[PDB]
Coordinates of C-alpha atoms in Angstrom, one line a residue:
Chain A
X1 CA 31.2 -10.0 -17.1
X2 CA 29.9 -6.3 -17.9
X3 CA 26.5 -5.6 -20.2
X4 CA 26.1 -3.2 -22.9
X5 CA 22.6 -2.4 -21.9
X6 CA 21.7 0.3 -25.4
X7 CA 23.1 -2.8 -27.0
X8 CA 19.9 -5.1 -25.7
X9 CA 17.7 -2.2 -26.6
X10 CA 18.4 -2.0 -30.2
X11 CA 18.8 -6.0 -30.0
X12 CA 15.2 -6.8 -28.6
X13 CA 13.5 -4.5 -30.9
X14 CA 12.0 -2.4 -27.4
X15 CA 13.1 0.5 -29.6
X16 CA 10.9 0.2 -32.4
X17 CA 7.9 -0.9 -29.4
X18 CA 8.4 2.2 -28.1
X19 CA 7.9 4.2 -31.7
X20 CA 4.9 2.5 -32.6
X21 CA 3.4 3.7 -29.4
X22 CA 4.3 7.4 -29.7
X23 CA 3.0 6.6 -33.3
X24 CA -0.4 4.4 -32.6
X25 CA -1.5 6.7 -29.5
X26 CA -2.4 10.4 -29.8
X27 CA 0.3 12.9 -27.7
X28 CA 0.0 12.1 -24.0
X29 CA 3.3 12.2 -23.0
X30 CA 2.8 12.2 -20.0
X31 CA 2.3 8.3 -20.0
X32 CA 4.2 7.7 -22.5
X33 CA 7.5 8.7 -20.7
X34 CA 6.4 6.7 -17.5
X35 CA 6.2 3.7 -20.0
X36 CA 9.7 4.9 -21.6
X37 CA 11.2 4.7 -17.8
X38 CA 9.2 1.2 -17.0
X39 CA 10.6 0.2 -19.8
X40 CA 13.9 0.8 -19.0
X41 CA 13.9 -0.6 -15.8
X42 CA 12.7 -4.1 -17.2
X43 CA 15.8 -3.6 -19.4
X44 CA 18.2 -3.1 -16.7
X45 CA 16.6 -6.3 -14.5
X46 CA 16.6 -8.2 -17.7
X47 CA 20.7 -7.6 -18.3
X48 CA 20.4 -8.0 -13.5
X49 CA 19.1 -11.8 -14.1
X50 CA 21.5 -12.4 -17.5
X51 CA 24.8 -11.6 -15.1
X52 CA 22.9 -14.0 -12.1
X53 CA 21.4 -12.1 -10.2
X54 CA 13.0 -14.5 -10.6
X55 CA 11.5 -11.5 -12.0
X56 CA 7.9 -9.9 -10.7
X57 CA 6.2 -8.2 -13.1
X58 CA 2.3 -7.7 -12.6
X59 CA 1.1 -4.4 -13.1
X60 CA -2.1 -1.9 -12.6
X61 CA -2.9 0.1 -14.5
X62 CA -5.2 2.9 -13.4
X63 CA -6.9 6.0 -14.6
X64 CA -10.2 6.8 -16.5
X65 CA -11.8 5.8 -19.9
X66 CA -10.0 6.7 -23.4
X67 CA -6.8 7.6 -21.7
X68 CA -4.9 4.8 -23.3
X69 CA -5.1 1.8 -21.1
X70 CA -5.4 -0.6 -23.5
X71 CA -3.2 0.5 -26.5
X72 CA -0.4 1.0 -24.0
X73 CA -1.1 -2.7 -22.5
X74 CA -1.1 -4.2 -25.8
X75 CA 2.3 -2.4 -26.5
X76 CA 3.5 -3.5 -23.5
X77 CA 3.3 -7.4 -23.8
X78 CA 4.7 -7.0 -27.3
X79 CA 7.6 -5.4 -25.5
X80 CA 7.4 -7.9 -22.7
X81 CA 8.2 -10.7 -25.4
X82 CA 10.5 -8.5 -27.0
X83 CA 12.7 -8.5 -23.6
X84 CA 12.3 -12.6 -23.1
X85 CA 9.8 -12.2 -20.1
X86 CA 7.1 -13.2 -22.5
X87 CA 7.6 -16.8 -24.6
X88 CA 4.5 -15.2 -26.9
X89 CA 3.9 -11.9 -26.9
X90 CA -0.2 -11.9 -26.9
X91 CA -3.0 -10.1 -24.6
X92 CA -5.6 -11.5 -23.5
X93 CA -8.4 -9.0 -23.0
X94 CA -11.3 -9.9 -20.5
X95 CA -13.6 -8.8 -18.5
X96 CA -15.6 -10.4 -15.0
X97 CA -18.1 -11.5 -17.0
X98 CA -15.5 -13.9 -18.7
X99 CA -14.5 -15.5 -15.5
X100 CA -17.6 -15.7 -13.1
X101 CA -19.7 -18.1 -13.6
X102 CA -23.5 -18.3 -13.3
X103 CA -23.9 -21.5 -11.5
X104 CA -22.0 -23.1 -8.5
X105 CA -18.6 -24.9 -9.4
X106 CA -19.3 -23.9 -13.2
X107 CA -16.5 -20.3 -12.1
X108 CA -13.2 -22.3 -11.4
X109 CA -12.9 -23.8 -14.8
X110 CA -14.3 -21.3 -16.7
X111 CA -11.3 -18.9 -15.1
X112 CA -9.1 -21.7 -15.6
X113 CA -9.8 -22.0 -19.6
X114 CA -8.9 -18.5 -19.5
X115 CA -5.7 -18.7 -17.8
X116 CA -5.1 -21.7 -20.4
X117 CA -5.8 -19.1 -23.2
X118 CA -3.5 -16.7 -21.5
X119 CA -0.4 -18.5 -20.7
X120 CA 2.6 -17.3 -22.7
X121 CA 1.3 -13.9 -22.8
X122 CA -0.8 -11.1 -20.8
X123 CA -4.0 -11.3 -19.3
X124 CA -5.9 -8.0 -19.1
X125 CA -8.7 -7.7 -16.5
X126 CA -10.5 -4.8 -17.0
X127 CA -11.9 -3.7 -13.8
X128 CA -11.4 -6.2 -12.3
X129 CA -12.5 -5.0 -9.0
X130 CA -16.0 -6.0 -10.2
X131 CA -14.8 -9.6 -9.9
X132 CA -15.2 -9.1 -5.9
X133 CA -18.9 -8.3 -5.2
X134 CA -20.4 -9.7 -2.1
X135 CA -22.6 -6.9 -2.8
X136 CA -24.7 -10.1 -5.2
X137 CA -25.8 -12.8 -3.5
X138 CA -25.4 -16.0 -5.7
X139 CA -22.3 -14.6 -7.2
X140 CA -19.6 -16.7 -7.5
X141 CA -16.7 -13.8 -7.6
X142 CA -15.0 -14.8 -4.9
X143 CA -13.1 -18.2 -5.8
X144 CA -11.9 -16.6 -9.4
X145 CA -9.6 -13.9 -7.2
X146 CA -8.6 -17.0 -5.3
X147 CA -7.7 -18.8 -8.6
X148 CA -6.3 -15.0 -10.0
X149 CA -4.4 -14.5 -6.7
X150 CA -2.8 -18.1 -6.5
X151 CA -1.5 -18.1 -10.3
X152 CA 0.3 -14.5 -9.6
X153 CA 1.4 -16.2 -6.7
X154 CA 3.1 -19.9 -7.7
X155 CA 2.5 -20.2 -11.3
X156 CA 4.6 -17.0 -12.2
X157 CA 7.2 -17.3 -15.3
X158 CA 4.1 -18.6 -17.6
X159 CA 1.5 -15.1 -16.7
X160 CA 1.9 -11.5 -17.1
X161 CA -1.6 -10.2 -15.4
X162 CA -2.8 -6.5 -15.4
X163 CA -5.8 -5.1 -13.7
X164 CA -7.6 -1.7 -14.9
X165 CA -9.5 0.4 -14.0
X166 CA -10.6 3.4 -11.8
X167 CA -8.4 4.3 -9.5
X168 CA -10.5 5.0 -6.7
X169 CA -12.2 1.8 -7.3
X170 CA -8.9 -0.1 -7.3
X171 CA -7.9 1.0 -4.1
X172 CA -11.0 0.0 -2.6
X173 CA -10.5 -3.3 -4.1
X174 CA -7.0 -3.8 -2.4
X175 CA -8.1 -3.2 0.9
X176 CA -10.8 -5.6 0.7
X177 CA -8.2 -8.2 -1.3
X178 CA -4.7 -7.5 0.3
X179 CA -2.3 -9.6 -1.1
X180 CA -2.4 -8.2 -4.4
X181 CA -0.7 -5.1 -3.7
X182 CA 2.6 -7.6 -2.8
X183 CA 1.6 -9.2 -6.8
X184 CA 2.1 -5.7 -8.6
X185 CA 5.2 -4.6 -9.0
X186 CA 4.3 -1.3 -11.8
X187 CA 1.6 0.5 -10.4
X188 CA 1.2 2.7 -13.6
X189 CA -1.0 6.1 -13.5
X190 CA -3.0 7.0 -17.0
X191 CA -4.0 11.3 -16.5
X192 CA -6.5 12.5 -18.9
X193 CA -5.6 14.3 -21.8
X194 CA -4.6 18.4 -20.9
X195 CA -7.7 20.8 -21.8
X196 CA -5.7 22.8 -25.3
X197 CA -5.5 18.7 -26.0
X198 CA -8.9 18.1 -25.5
X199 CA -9.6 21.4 -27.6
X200 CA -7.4 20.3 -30.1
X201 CA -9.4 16.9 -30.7
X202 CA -13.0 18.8 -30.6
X203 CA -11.5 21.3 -33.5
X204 CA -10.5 17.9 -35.2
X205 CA -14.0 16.2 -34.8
X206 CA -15.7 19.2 -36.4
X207 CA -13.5 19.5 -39.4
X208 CA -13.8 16.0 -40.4
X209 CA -17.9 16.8 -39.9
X210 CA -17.6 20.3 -41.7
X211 CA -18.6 22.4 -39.0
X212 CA -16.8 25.8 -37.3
X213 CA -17.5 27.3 -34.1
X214 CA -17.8 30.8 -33.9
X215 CA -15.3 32.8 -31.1
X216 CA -17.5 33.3 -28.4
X217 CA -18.5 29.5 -28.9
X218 CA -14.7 28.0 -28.6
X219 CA -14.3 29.8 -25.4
X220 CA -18.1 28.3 -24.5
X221 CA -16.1 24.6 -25.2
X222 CA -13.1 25.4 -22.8
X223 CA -15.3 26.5 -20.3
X224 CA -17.3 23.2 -20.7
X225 CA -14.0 20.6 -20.9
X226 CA -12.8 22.2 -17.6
X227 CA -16.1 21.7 -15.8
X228 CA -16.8 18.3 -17.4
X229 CA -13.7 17.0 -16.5
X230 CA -14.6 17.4 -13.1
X231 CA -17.8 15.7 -13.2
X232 CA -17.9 11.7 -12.5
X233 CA -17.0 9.1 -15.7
X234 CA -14.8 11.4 -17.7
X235 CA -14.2 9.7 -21.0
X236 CA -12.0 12.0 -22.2
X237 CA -12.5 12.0 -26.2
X238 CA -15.9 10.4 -26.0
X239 CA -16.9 12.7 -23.3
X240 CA -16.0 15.4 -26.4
X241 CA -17.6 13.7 -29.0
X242 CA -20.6 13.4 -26.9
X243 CA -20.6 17.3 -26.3
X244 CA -20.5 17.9 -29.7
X245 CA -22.9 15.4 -30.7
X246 CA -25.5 17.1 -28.5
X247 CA -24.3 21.0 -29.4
X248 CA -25.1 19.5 -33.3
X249 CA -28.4 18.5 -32.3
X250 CA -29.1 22.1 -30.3
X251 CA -27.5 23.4 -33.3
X252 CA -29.9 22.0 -35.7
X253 CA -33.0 22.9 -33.5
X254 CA -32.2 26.7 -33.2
X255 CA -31.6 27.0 -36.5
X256 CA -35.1 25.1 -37.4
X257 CA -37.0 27.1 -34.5
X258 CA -35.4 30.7 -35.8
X259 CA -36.5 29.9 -39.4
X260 CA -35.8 33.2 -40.4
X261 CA -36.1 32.2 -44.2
X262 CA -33.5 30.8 -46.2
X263 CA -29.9 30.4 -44.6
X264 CA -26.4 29.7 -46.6
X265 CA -23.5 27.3 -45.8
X266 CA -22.2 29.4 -43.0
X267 CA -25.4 29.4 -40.9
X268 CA -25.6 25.7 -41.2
X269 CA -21.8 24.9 -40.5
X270 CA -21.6 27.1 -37.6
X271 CA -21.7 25.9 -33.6
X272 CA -23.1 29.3 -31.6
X273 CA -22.2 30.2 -28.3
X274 CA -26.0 29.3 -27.4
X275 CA -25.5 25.5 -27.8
X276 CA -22.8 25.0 -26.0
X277 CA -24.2 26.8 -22.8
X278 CA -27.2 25.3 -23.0
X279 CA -25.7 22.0 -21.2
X280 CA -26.9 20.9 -18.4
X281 CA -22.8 21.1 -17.5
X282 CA -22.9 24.5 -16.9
X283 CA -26.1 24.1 -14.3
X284 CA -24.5 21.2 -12.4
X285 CA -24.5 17.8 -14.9
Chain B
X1 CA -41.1 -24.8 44.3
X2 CA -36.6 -25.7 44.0
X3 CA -34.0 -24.2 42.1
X4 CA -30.7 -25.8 41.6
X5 CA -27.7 -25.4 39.3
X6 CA -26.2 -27.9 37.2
X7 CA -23.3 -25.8 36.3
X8 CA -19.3 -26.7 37.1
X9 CA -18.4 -25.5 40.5
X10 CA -14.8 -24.6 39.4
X11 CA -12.9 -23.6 36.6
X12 CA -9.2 -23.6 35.3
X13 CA -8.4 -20.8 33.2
X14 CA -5.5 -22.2 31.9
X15 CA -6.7 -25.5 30.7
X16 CA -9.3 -23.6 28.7
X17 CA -6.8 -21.3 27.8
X18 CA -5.1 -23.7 26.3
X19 CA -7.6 -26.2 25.5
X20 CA -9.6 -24.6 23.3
X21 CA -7.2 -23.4 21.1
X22 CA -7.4 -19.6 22.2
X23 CA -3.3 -19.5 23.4
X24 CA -2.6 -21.1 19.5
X25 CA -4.2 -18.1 17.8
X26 CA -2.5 -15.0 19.7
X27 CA 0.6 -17.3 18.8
X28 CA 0.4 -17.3 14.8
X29 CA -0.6 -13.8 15.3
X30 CA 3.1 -13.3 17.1
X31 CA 4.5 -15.4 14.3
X32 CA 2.4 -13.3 11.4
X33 CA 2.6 -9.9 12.8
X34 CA 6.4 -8.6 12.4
X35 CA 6.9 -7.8 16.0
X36 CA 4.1 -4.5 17.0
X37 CA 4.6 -5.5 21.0
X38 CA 2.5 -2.8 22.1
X39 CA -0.7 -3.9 20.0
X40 CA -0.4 -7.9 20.7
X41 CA -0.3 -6.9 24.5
X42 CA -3.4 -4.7 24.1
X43 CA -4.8 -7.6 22.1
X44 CA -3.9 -10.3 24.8
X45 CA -5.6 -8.5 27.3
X46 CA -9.0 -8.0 24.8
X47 CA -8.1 -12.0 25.0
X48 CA -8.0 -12.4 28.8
X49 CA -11.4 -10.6 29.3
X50 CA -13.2 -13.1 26.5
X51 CA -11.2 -15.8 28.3
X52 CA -13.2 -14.8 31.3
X53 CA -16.2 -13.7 30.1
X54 CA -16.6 -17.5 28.4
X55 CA -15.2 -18.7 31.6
X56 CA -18.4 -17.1 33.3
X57 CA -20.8 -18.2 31.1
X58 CA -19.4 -22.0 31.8
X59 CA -20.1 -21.6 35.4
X60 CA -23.6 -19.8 34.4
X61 CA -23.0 -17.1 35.4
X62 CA -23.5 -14.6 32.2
X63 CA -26.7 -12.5 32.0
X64 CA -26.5 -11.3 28.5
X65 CA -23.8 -11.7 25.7
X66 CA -21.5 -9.3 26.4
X67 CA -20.9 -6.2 24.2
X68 CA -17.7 -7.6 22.1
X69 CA -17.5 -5.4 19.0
X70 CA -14.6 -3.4 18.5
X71 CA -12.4 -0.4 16.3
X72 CA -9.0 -0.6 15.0
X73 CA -7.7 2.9 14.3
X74 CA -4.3 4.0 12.9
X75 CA -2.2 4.1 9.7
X76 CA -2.2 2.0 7.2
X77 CA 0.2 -1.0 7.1
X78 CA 0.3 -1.5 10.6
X79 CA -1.2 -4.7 11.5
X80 CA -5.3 -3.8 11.3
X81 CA -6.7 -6.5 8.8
X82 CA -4.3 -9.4 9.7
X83 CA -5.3 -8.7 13.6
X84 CA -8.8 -9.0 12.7
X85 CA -8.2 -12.6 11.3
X86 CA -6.9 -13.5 14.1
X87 CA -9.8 -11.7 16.5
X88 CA -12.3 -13.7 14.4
X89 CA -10.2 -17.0 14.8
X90 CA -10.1 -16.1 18.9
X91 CA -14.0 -15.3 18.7
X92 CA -14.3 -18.7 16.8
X93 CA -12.8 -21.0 19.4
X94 CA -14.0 -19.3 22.6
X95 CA -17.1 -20.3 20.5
X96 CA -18.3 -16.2 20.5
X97 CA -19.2 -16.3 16.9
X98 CA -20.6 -19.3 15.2
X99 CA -17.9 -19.6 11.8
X100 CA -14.8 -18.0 11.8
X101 CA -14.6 -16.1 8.4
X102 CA -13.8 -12.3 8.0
X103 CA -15.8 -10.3 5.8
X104 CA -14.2 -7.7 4.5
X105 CA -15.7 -4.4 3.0
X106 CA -15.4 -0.4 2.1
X107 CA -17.6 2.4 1.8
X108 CA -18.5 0.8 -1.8
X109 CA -19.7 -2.5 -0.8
X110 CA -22.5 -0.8 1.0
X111 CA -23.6 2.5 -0.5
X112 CA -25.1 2.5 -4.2
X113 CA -25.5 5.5 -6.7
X114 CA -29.7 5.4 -7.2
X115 CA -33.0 6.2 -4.6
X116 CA -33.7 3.2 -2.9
X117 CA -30.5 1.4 -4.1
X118 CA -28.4 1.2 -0.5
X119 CA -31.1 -1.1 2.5
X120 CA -30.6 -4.3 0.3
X121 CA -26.9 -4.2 -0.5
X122 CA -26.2 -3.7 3.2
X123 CA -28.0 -6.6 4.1
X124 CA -26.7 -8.7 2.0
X125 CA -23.7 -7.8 3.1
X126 CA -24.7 -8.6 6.4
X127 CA -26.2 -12.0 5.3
X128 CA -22.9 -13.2 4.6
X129 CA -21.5 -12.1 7.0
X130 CA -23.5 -13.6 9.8
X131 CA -21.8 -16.2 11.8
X132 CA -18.4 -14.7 11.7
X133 CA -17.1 -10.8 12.1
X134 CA -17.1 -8.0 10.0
X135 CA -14.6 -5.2 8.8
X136 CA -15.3 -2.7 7.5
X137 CA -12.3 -0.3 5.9
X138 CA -13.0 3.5 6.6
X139 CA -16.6 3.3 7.7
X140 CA -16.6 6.8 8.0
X141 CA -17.3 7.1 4.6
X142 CA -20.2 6.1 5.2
X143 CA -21.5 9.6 6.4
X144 CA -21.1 12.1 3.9
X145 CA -23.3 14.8 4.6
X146 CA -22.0 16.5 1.0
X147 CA -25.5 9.8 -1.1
X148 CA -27.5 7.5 0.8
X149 CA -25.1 6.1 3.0
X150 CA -27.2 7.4 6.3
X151 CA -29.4 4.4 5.8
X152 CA -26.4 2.1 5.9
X153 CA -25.4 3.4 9.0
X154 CA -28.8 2.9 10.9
X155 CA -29.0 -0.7 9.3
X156 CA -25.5 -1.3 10.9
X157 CA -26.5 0.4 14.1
X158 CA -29.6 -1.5 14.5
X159 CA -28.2 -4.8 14.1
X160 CA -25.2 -4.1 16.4
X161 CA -27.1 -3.6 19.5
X162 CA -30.1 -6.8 18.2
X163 CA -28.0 -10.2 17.3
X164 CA -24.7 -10.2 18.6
X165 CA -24.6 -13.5 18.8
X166 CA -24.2 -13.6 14.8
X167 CA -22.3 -10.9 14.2
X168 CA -19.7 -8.8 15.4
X169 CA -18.1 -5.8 13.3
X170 CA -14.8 -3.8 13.5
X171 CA -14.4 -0.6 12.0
X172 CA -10.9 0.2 11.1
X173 CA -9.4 3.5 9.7
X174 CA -7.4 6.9 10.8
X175 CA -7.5 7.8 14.2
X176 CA -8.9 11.8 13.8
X177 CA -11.5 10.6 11.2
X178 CA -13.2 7.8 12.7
X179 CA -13.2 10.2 15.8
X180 CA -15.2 12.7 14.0
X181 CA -17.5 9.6 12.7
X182 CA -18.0 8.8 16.4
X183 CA -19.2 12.5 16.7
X184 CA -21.5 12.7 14.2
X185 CA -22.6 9.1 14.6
X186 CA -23.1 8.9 18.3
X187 CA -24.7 5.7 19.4
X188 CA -21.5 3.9 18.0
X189 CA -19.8 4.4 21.2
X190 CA -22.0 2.8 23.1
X191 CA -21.6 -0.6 21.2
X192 CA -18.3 -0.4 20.8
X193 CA -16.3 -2.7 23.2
X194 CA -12.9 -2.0 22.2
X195 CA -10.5 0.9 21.1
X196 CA -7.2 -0.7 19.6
X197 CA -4.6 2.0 19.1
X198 CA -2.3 0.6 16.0
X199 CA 0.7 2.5 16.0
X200 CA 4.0 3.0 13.5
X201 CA 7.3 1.8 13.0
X202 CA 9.9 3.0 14.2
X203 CA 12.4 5.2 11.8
X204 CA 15.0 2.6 13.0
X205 CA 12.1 -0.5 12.2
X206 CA 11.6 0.5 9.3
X207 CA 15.4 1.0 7.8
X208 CA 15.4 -2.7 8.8
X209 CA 12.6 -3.7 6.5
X210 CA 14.2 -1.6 3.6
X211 CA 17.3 -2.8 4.2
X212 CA 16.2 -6.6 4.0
X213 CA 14.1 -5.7 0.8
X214 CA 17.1 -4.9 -0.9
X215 CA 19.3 -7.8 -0.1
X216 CA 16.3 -10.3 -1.3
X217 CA 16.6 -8.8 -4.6
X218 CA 20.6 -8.3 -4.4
X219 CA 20.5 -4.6 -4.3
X220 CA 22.9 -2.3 -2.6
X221 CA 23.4 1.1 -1.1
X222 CA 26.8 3.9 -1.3
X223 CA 26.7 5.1 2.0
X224 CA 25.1 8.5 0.4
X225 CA 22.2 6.5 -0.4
X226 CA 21.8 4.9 3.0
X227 CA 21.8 9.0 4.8
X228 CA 19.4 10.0 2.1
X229 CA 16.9 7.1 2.8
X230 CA 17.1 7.6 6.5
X231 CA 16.1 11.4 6.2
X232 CA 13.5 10.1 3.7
X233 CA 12.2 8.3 6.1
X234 CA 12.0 10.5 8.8
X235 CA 9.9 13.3 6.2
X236 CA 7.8 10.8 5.0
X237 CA 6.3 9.4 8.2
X238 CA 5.0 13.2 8.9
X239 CA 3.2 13.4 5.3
X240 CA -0.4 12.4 4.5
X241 CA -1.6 8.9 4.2
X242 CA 2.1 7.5 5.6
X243 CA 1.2 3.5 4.9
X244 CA 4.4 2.3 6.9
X245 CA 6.3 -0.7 5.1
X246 CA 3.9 0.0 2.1
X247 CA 5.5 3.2 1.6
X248 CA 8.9 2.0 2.0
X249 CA 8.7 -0.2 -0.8
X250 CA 6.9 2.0 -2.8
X251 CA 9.7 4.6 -1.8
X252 CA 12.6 1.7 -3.1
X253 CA 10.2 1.1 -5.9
X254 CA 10.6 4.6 -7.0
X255 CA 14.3 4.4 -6.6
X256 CA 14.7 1.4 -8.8
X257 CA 12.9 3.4 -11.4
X258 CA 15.2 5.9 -11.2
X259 CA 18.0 4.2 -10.7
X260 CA 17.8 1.9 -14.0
X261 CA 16.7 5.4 -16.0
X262 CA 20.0 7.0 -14.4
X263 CA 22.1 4.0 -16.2
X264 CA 20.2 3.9 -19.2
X265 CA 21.1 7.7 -20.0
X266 CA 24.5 8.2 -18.8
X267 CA 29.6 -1.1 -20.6
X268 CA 28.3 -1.6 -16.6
X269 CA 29.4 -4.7 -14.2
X270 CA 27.1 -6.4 -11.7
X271 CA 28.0 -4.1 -8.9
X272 CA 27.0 -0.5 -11.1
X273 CA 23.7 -2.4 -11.8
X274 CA 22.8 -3.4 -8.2
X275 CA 23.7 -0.4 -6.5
X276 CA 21.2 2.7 -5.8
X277 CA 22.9 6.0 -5.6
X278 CA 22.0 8.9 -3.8
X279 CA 20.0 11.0 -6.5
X280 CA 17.7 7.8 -7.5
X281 CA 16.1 8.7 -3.3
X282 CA 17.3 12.5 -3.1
X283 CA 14.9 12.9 -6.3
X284 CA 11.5 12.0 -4.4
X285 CA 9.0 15.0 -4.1
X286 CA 9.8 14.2 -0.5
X287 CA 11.9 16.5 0.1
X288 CA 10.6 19.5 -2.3
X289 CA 7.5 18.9 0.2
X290 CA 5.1 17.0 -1.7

């Protein structure tokens, strides 16, 4: 007659999905809270259906590289099964070279096999707006969205599908393929990581290396995260790992070109200032 | 030295109206197009002149092909793509274009990242799309002077004025940017047949929608919630990138977020569960201004 809804939370086991995502993915809040509320809400329209009252629960989700995409979509079809919407709770990772295939009529069961695979669980197309390119002549992209699009359509109670991505290059892909946007039901927005964050994780990467920076040198880094953040295919941590990777390698080649004479442990842990700026970052790219 | 026509001497509009399957289209269009009255008149008329125009050429009478590409500006969610369906189904059986399929495309489908890159995706594009009609989503991204989408354009341009008797193209987008394309891109103009004006819902159209959306999936509305949606409404439709009954559902989206969070925080029957109050619409950066 009424529901005790905290009463499904702690009965599912949601709970203890949603701790071993604040525990398996480094602070981003941000997201985390937006999966906290979706959560929530397929709670509530869980307990909707148990009182009588056909579910639709696609999702996209959309943002760039290493900002927790697929961490949080794993969590989420444990959670999914957790909440009965899922018989087993398993995600199917894939790309468009998984569902395309090379020659004529060899596409169709090939996306088919992977919807067999899928069934019960999630299926996770990673941007998947690479699976529409009439841009390639003799690709056969087209009839797997037909195929993709018809499942999410009919075939619902069996499929939990979520698309990834860039969002720019999503919304191109909707205009192009309307009738998806009617599919999705959570469109789900992953923000990079703030800059002290990104600082924070650079500081990290160099003490697990052995390696300080100097003052003027930190300030070099924020300077560079802000800027580079701004600049096309932002991969957040590898993005950082990447910068460091190359200030090491500047590093290394002042220090062999000033050859001074004999240097101690500081000289030889220690990022300067100079290559840092040195980036091509701070020109333009 | 004799000349002498072997053409009809008459023709019934009608009867070809109706016998070629022309009236059947702009009907699914009525039945697939919730009800845009001004638009599907300015389309029947676009449908009168081919009408006529095919009607001419049956009594050999047509010099050329005519001129019969065309632009659909306005917001989104207002008709464009599924009237274009229908425009190549029209342009099919008044036998204008050769296959009826739609291509559909954006700025992306045409203009690569790399020298040299752009010329053969185009045309390829254009390969498949011969036959039938082309739509293209925001063409004026094609022209960003700020990026080698200016030898897209002159590909596009070229083949618009050549073969029209493969392809016809209709660029779709907002209103004030395509004009600004049509500026900066003048020979455009000249090919262009037709200017469709696609315009909004009503405030009152669209409290319909949302109100039907709700009562599918057995939700319902305090009477605080049903002022609070209205006003929404009415800010909304003044705010960037308004997508019409897009945004509505995105807007009831956001309230059934907020909604089953409300609960959540603060034992519940079916009617606390299916009702939306006030604060889960009054909480919308809508009316803070973003």
């Amino acid at each position: 007659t009424s529901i005790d809804l905290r009463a499904e939370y702690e009965g599912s086991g949601a709970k203890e999905v949603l701790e071993e995502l604040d525990r398996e993915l480094i602070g981003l809040k941000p997201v985390k809270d937006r999966i906290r509320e979706t959560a929530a809400l397929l709670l509530v329209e869980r307990a909707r259906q148990k009182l009588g009252l056909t579910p639709t629960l696609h999702m996209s989700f959309t943002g760039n590289p290493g900002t927790g995409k697929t961490t949080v979509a794993l969590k989420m079809a444990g959670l999914l099964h957790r909440l009965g919407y899922v018989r087993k709770g398993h995600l199917v990772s894939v790309t468009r070279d998984d569902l395309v295939g090379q020659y004529i009529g060899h596409t169709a069961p090939k996306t088919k096999e992977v919807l067999k695979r899928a069934m019960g669980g999630v299926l996770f197309i990673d941007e998947a707006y690479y699976l529409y390119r009439p841009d390639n002549e003799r690709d056969y992209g087209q009839e797997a969205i037909e195929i993709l699009l018809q499942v999410m359509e009919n075939n619902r109670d069996d499929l939990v599908v979520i698309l990834a991505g860039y969002a720019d290059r999503m919304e191109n892909f909707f205009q192009s393929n309307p009738g998806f946007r009617s599919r999705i039901a959570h469109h789900i927005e992953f923000p990079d990581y703030s800059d002290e964050e990104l600082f924070e994780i650079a500081g990290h990467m160099l003490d697990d290396q052995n390696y300080q920076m100097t003052p003027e040198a930190e300030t070099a880094l924020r300077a560079y995260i802000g800027l580079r953040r701004n600049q096309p295919h932002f991969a957040n941590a590898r993005s950082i790992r990447n910068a460091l990777d190359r200030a090491r390698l500047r590093q290394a080649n002042r220090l062999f070109t000033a050859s001074s004479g004999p240097l101690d442990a500081r000289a030889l842990s220690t990022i300067a200032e100079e290559d840092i700026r040195a980036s091509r970052v701070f020109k333009g790219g």
